[PDB]
Each structure stands twice: as structure tokens, then as C-alpha cells.
Symmetry: C5
Subunit: 268 residues, 5 copies
Amino acid sequence: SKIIFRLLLNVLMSIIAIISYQWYEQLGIHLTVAPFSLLGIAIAIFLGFRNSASYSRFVEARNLWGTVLIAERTLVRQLRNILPAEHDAHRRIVSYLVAFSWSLKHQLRKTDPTADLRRLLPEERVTEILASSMPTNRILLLAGNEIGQLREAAKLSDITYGLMDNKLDELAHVLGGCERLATTPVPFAYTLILQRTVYLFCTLLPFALVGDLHYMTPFVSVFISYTFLSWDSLAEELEDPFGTAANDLPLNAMCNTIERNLLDMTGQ
Amino acid sequence: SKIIFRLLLNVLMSIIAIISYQWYEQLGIHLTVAPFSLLGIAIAIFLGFRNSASYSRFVEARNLWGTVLIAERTLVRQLRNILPAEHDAHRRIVSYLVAFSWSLKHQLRKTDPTADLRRLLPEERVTEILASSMPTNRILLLAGNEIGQLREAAKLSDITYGLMDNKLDELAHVLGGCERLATTPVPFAYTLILQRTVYLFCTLLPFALVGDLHYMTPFVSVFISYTFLSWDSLAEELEDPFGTAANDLPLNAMCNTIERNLLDMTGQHPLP
Amino acid sequence: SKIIFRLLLNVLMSIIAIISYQWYEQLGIHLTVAPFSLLGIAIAIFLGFRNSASYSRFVEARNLWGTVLIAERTLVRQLRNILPAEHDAHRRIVSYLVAFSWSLKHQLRKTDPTADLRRLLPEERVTEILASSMPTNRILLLAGNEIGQLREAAKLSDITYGLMDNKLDELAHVLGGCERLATTPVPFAYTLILQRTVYLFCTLLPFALVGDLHYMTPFVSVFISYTFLSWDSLAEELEDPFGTAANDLPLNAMCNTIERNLLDMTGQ
Amino acid sequence: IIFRLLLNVLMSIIAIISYQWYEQLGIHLTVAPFSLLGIAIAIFLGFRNSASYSRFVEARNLWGTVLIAERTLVRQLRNILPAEHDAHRRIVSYLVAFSWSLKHQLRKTDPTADLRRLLPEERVTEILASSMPTNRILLLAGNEIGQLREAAKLSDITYGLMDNKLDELAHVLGGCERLATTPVPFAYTLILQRTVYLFCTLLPFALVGDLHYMTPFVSVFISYTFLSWDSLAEELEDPFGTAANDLPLNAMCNTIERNLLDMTGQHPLPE
Amino acid sequence: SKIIFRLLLNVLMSIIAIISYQWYEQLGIHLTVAPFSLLGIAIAIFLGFRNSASYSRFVEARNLWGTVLIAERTLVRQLRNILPAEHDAHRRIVSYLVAFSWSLKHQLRKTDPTADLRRLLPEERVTEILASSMPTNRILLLAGNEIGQLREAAKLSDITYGLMDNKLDELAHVLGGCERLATTPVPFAYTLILQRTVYLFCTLLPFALVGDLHYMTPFVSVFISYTFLSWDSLAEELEDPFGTAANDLPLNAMCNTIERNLLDMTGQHP
Ligand SMILES: [Cl-]
Ligand SMILES: [Cl-]
Ligand SMILES: [Cl-]
Ligand SMILES: [Cl-]
Ligand SMILES: [Cl-]
Ligand SMILES: [Cl-]
Ligand SMILES: [Cl-]
Ligand SMILES: [Cl-]
Ligand SMILES: [Cl-]
Ligand SMILES: [Cl-]
Ligand SMILES: [Zn+2]
Ligand SMILES: [Zn+2]
Ligand SMILES: [Zn+2]
Ligand SMILES: [Zn+2]
Ligand SMILES: [Zn+2]
Ligand SMILES: [Zn+2]
Ligand SMILES: [Zn+2]
Ligand SMILES: [Zn+2]
Ligand SMILES: [Zn+2]
Ligand SMILES: [Zn+2]
Ligand SMILES: [Zn+2]
Ligand SMILES: [Zn+2]
Ligand SMILES: [Zn+2]
Ligand SMILES: [Zn+2]
Ligand SMILES: [Zn+2]
Ligand SMILES: [Zn+2]
């Protein structure tokens, strides 16, 4: 909460305004409420639309992760339904699917996958994966080798191969989606503009309130600031969905659910 | 709603400002309207967006439930159309599909699936299902085994297997979509912030209103407070569409519909 | 057009405020514009968001019906192009597709589909359909059966069977969508809340306008009221897409269009 | 539009040279009520313009799909049946006829010349006989693909890959039809237009109090804002209406013709 | 983004309003705030909706480019998984997929693709591609011949050919979406209204503010103009996402990422 300092700096800005209202006539400065209404409203409208975009970006992240669990569940389901004997293949594929999740998590958090990957895969595979500048993509390529092998060994027909291939595509879209969200921020200009504007607004506001509210100036002014600043900071918290804040996605729990899910489906 | 408390708790504070308005003088308190116009409009705008976000959650949730019915209807149709004679599988698969929907409702209402499960499937299966930490998924896996067995037995080809396989994917997307709406709400700041704000605004509003309205003050403040608080609680309601409030989804009716659909006439169908 | 009732009731509410404006401050009752601008604005925002939802639900009802035409057109096309010889199957499948439309209309309007079904299908099939607790869904099953026969008789392969099965899936999505829309209104609370506030607001309004407009009160309180009610009433006129009112979907004409189209494509 | 700005100036001058008589009599117009009205209308115009915009965008997407589907079908024909140039040419004909015919259908203009240039007279009579000419064209494109399958030049699989493209065109056809026979509101766009229209005419009277001579200036600026927003919605609401901008629809049908002649090597001219 | 010119011209207009407020009474002109408030809020609402549309277009554009990378990655994945031995095919298709991306960037920027094409493909292919009303389209058709030839040679079945066909189908959709976003400014009613509107409003605002603020006019007037103009020009940037403004897609970087991914997946080293 940087908000609380911003509130107290605003109570102080109001005192400065009461004490200084005297020399207003002298200095030749009069400030009515009316234009601050115009400005405040304008700012609230833009804050509303901005916040809308931030929430949508957070929702997209959530959906992207939702697909991971859906597509992995159904790939394992398919593997069991189509090749119920082939538990060798099941185990290999499930570990790739589980690696994909953790890999994706680490990629977005800008952290080290080595532990999670080493915990899941053989060494001849882990070094291949960490070798690529696109590890997560590499895990998908390898999961693909698995299904292709079962195809070449005639365990899968072209059709059944096709069914599982679609699920890798789904995972591909998730990877791209997340990378896209990670690297493409909501234009910095939104935070640039609005952060400036909101701060300057809350700051100048008591200077305009004072003529009308006098000593009441602090109370009302801090209230209006709390409304604006709270809404503005909610946008901020929603904007980095892949971060570590408690307000961000619990990527760790999500990857756990995924792992436990795929292990449950295989009996582990 | 649960608004009449705070609507009354507000008629009080509105008399206070009719008794106080001459004493503003003495204490040193001026309070025009225009600042409260500004603050009120801002809150309206934010209430607007919040409510819209809440409704989308409602609508998505309704849609995900819609797909359960569609996807189950079409899977049964496919089984009837492609394997018209295989009533044993028809029956097995339908009860899994019916279990699926009830199981999903229990999952989301945080209630016990056992009664509904036992009503539909044999007990060894009820224990396979309850054994899992994700029972709905387990029912899907079991439904899939039914389809896969018909395939291993060469009653389905790969193509016709895949037609049915698609429908199970559709249901997996419902499960996933539903879990996503349930585990994560709209981040808890949303409700914490807005409720504080709307109410704080509502109580102070008359203190600033009197000077203009004089006597008509407590009315025109309760009217405004109704509007703001109405909107805020409806949002709070729709936000949790698997809840049990009046404006949430009728999940029990929806599973009843699904059930009556699949089991329509002791499960009997015209044969091609 | 009960709107012109409320407009008239409004002219009357002006006139009591015009003449009763005297005894106002003696009582101590004042109504300024400013707080009614706050309410008016807040209500307009909520009216906006709401009518939005109303509009979307109506657009969805059109889209769904639109898909009937699209999917039935394309199923008929596929049958002509894949099985040009097989006019018997053509005519059967077409009568089911036409029955489906009419049946869906009857279900949404809660009317008796019997005559239409009897004009299109043999009595036995009608009996099958009407015996079901879900007749329209049963029409899909029968059409599926016709397609299934073609498959058994090897006139269709699995692949081409599949191309046509996809179309019955689309019709399934239409049927579910309509059912969902029919049983899921825009939540009542919206219409409740808003009808209270809009009604009370347009009532209390010439009161809060008279001490500003005096003799221009009626002509301005009514123009404002017509504006809120016009816009509140656009919701009313969009919330019953399946109805028979002038502003509701012309489902009979759309059903004729569907039938006319399928008959054009089979040269009847 | 510019007629209603000239009327606004006229009403503004009336406002000044009449402000005298009427406020003396008991009949007053303040700014605050017309400010609540105007903001409400602005809000409504906002939501209205949102719905309009999204019908405009839907029309662009549908037409976008024609370009995409037609390109990919022809690509599929070349990649899968490289040698069947006669089929390539017939199919491209129908594809191009489909576009032009859709455009004609939406703009309620005559497709005859486009059909006669593109197809044999037998087919043109057949297509013109139908009450659903565009759908009939898709059906004929269908027969082409169908015959290639009958002759065992397409397998059921590869027939299917091409069939999808025809379905995409089916979706476009119906989507556009639905966008055309609209709107959805009924004669309520006439209500909000008149609401804006009346609001802009009463407004100088409500302003003259505060602005006197400045009235016509500030009044016409405001009127302009509302009337512009309103008429932009009118345009957007009706992408296929009788007074629409036909430049991009014509651009699209030309692009696709051009693209397909390119893909089938009917372009460039030979050396 | 010569926005500061518009702001300074606004500070100027403010002084013009102060110095001329003296003559104000004498000339016979009154200008209250309340009517400018009405217009101002209207315009704000309009900028709100407008800006939101612009953002949407930008997000769509970004998404489409997202799909290039996804679809191309997965095409190469299918090629390796299904035809592990056909490394010639691997290389030729990859150079088409890489040519596709750069060619798309060129198309959208209206620049010449000749250099990049020549870097990636034999000259015969370059000539074929350059000869076409739509080079990206021709590139997809060439990629299509590759998998087509593999199908002809019975190295792909109809089904596995189809799986790969779908990916080219996806690229066609991307191509179309980008064409649509690039040739869809809309009717230039977003300049006759929003740009000049906001502009005029901002310069008349001080004339209207001055009776109330006196010397404070330019401070308040600048703050309000900043707010509106910031909002407006950000819309402008977002509206044209394939442009070269600050806030427009780094298409060259996105193309490099694409190329690098595809090179990574097929054994090769940048
Ligand atoms: Cl899936
Ligand atoms: Cl296993
Ligand atoms: Cl389905
Ligand atoms: Cl279709
Ligand atoms: Cl026939
Ligand atoms: Cl026929
Ligand atoms: Cl396509
Ligand atoms: Cl050719
Ligand atoms: Cl050719
Ligand atoms: Cl893909
Ligand atoms: Zn899926
Ligand atoms: Zn296993
Ligand atoms: Zn082993
Ligand atoms: Zn490391
Ligand atoms: Zn489906
Ligand atoms: Zn049965
Ligand atoms: Zn009093
Ligand atoms: Zn379709
Ligand atoms: Zn026939
Ligand atoms: Zn009705
Ligand atoms: Zn496509
Ligand atoms: Zn050719
Ligand atoms: Zn050309
Ligand atoms: Zn004067
Ligand atoms: Zn894809
Ligand atoms: Zn290779």
C-alpha cells in the first residue's frame, strides 16, 4: 500500500490549503469546484475504461491457464481410452505434460525451471530442454515425439494420432498466449497518463474545495482521493497477472492441481 | 434485499442533518453538493463497470452449463445413431453423463455427491469416483472407457470414435471453465474497496444534501442510497453464479433438466 | 405504448407542482436540481449497462435462428453434392430439417406443432416425436437416423457421415441456446431495481425543476421523462425475442424462409 | 446535417431576440436540467454507438472470411489437384461469382452483368431463377468439388477439407443476410435521433440566459458534437444500407477476383 | 507525438483570455462553465468509447501476430513428428514460413520484401512471389506445394496432410485479419469529430474558465487539455498498430523471434 502515504500527503495538502486560503485573494488565485468536476468525471470515465482493459487482461491469463488443465486432462484421458495397455507411453507423456506446466510457470515468473524439470524428466532430456532458448516449446516438441512414435509403431492410427495432436495445438496456443501477455504490456502510456493525472488531480483538488468546504476540505478531499486512488491501483494489481503478489495468479497452486490431476488419472 | 438495514441505518443519519444544518454555522462546517456530485458520479461509473464484469461471469457460467446439456444430448444421439442396438452401452454411458452433471453441481456448491451418485451408478464405481480428489474428471474418464471399449471391440471405427471423443472434450472444457469461475472470484479488493466506498458515500451524502433540500432531505437520500446499494449487491450476487442467492444459477433445476432429457422415455428411441 | 400514459401522468405531475409551489418553503421542503442530476446520471449509467445486456440477448436469439438457416442449407448442400442420386433420402432429410425449424418455433411460442408436423412427416414419425418430452431434440434423432441408414448401407463413409453429423451438432447448439435463452431472462433484479428508480425519478422530477423553470416545468419534465422511458422501454422491447409482438423475431416468416430455401435446393 | 446547424443558428438568434418576452412571463430555462438531459443522451449515444460499431466490425469480419476462405480453397485445389486446371477455372468462377453476387444481394443491385461475365448462360439462368442466387452459387461450387470426388480425384478426406471452406462461405452468407434485414431496435433509432434533434433545438433557449450573444456559437458547437456522434452511429449501424460507402465492398470483391486469377496463373499476361 | 505544441498553444490561448477578459464586459460576451461542462463530459464519454475501440484493434493485431508464431511452431512440430526423416522438406517449408512472416511485416508496413525474400529463398521463387498481387498468399501456396508433393509421394496420408493443411489455413486467417485491420481505418468521422472537436473545445475552454479562475485559468486549462489530448492521441497510436509510432507493434522484433524459434526447432544456429 503506497496508497496510505498518498492519502496522508493529501491530508497535508489540505492543511496547506486551509492555511493558504487567506493569501488567495492577494495572490490573485481563485479556484471553483465546477472545472474540477469536469476534470474528475473525465478522469473517472478514463479510469473505468482503463480498469476494464486490465480486468480483461487478467481474465485472459486465467483462461489460458484453465486451458492447460483442460487439454492435459483430455490428452491423458485419450491416452488411457485409446491405448489402455501402454502405461510406458502414459508415464513418459504425463511427465512432459507436467513439465510443460512448470516450465510455463517458470518462464512467466522469469525463474529457474531446473529443479522442477529435473524432478520430472531424465537428464538426456533435461539438458536438451534447457539448451533451447525456448524450453517450454521444446517440451511440446518432445511430447510430440512420444505421440509420433506411437504412430510410427502403429499403436496409433493417423486418426487417433490426429485426435491427440489437436491437444498439443491447444497447448501451443496457451504458450503463445502467455508469452504474448508477458511481453506485450498494456501500453505504458495508460499508467503514464493516468498515474500523473490522478495524482495531480487529488493534489490540486483541496485548493479548489477549500473555497466551498473550508475546514471540511480535508475529509471530502481525502475521500475523493481514496475512491480514485483505489480504483487506479486495482488496475495496477490486475495488470501483471503473472507476478508474485497475492493478488496475482497462484501459479504454484495451479501447477500443483495440474500435476495431482494427471497423476490421479494414471493412479499415482 | 439485505439493504433495508442500511437503508434505514441511513434514514436516521438523514434526520440528523435536518437538525444540524443551522449548527453548521457554529461548528464551522460548510458542505456543498457539487463535491458529492463528483464523488457520486465516479462511484456510479465504477459500479457500472463492476456490475458489467459480474454479469459476464453469470453469463459465462450459464453458457458453460448450457453446453453440458448440448454436448450430452449430442453424444447420446451419436451413440443412438451409430450403434442403434447397443442399449447396454447407451445405459452405461447415459448414467455417467447424468452423474457428470450432478457431480459438477456438488463440486461447485461444496456439497456431498454421494446420494446422487449412488442413485445412478453401481457401488464399486461410486467408490472409484469418491476415491478421487477430482470426481467429475473421474466420471469423464469412466465415460471415455465406455467409448474406448466399443472401439477396442471394433464396434466403433477411429472416425466414429473421434466424433464421440469430441463431445467428451466439450465437457472437459465445461469442467475447466466452471472450476476457473469457482476457485478464483473477482480479486477480493473489488468487493472490499467498493462496499466501503458506496456506504461511506451513502451515510455522508445527507450532511451535504440538506442545505439545498432542507426538509425533503431524508427521502432524496434514501432514493440515492437505494440505487447505489441495489446495484452494488446485485453485482456481489451475480459475481458468484454457483451460489444460492436468488439471482444465481438454478443448478438443481438444470441438472433435473439434463437428467429428464437423457432418461426421457425409460431411455427408449426409434431405431434406423 | 403505455409510455404515452406516463408522459400524460407527467404533465399532470408538473401542474400540481406549478400550483403547489407556494406552500413549499413554509413546509420547508426544497428540491434543487443538483441531487437529481446525480441520480439521473447514475440511473442513465445503469440503464446503459442493462439495455446492453438486453440487446446482446436479442442479438443472440437472432444469431441462433440464423444458424438454423446456415446449417440446414449446408446439410442439404452436402447431401446433393455427396449423394446426388439419392433424392429419396434428400426428401426425408429435408422434411426433418423443416420439421425441426417449425418445431423449435412452436416450442419457443408454446404452441401445438402437430399440424405442421403432420404436413411434413408420416403419422408414425409424428407419434414418435410428440411422445417425447423433448420433441425438437427427437427430430434431430430421427434426422440422425436417416444419415445413419445411409451410413449402414455404405452410401456414406465414416468421413462423409461425419461431415453431416457436424451439422446436426450445430442444430443441437441452436436448440440448447434457444432453450437457455427462453428459461434465462436478463435477471429480474435488474428490471425490478431499474423500473422502481426510473419511475420514482420521473415522478419526483417536475417537483425539483419547478423552482427553476416554473411555467416551463411541464415541457421540460416531459422531454426528460420521455428520454428515460424511451430508453427504459427499448429494454422491454428486446427482452422477449421469441414472442409474437411486432418487435419480436418474426419466427413464422423465418420458418417459411427456411422451408423455401430447402425446397429451392431440392427443386420443389 | 449542415441544415440542422443553420437551423441551430436560426433558433439561437430567435432565442436572443425573444429571451426578452418569455422569461418576464414566468417561463424560465436554466442550464442544469439541460445538462442532466444532455449527459443522459450522451451516455445513451455512447451505448448506442457501441452496438453500431460492433455491427460494422461484424460486417468487416464476414467479408474478411470471404477473402480467406476463397483463397484457401483455391490453394487447396492447387496443392491437392495440381493438374486439374479446368476444375480450377470453373471453381474460381463460382467463387468470384459468389462474392459479386453477395455484394449485389446486400446492396440490392443487379447481379446480371457480373454473372454473365463470369459464368455460362445456362448457369446464369439457373442462378437467376432462384430466389436465393448466392446460396445457389455455393451449391454449384459444391457440385464441382462433388464431381471431383465422384471421379475419385478427391478422397473423402480431401473432399472434406474443401467442404469446410464452403461452410465458412455459408456462415458468411447468413451472417450478412442477418446484418442486412436488421436492425434490431426497429424505429427507435428515429426516436433517439429526434431526441437529439429536439435537445439541440431547445438548447440555445436554455443557454441564452448565461451566454446572451455567445449563444449561437456555443450552441452550434454542442449541436455539432451530438449530431456527429448520432450520424456516425447511423452509418455504422447499416453497413449494407442504400446510402452506405460502397468503396470497401467493391475493393473486396476486386481484391478477391485479382487474388484468384493470380493463384490460377491467369495473371500476369504471358510473354 | 508533438503534443507539447498543442499544450503550449493552449497556455498561449489562456493569456489571450486573461488579457481580453477586461474587454469582455465591454464587448458583450459572457461564457459560463456549466455549458462547457456539458460538452466536456459528452466528449469525455465519446473519447472513452472511442479509445476502447482503438485498444481492441491493437489487441486483435497483437493476437494475430501471436498466431503466426503459434501456427508456424506447430507446423514445424507436425513435420518433425510425422516425417522425422524428411529434413529437406523441413528446411524448405521453414524458409517459406519465415518468408511468410517477413513478407507479412512488409505488406503491413507497405515496404519492399525483395531483400528479405532474397535472403531466404532461391531467385525463381522470389520472382514468383514478387509477381503476385499478394506475396504472402503466394508464399502460403508454395508451402502448400511442399506438403502437397509429400502427399503425392505417399509420404503423407490424406489425414496427416490435412493436419498440416489446417496450419496453412490458420496462417491465411492471420493474413486476412491483418489485411482487415490495416485497410479498416473506418470512415474518417473520428477526425472530423474527435480530433478537431477535442482540439476546438480545449482552446475555447479558457475563454469560458476565465470569468471564474482569472489568473488560474492557464493552470486549470492546461491540466484539462492534457487529460483530453493524452487520451485522444493514445487512441490514435493504438488505432494504427502496424505503424512506426512509440506504442505500435515491434514487428521487426516479432519477426526475429519467429525466425529464431523456427531455426531452433530445425537444428539450425543464428
Ligand atoms: Cl480438450
Ligand atoms: Cl500409467
Ligand atoms: Cl455438440
Ligand atoms: Cl455449416
Ligand atoms: Cl430431391
Ligand atoms: Cl436434389
Ligand atoms: Cl479457411
Ligand atoms: Cl487453373
Ligand atoms: Cl493452377
Ligand atoms: Cl496451432
Ligand atoms: Zn480442447
Ligand atoms: Zn497407464
Ligand atoms: Zn518398460
Ligand atoms: Zn539453471
Ligand atoms: Zn458441440
Ligand atoms: Zn439404446
Ligand atoms: Zn432547512
Ligand atoms: Zn456451420
Ligand atoms: Zn434430390
Ligand atoms: Zn413479446
Ligand atoms: Zn478457415
Ligand atoms: Zn490451375
Ligand atoms: Zn493480378
Ligand atoms: Zn453582461
Ligand atoms: Zn492453431
Ligand atoms: Zn528436420
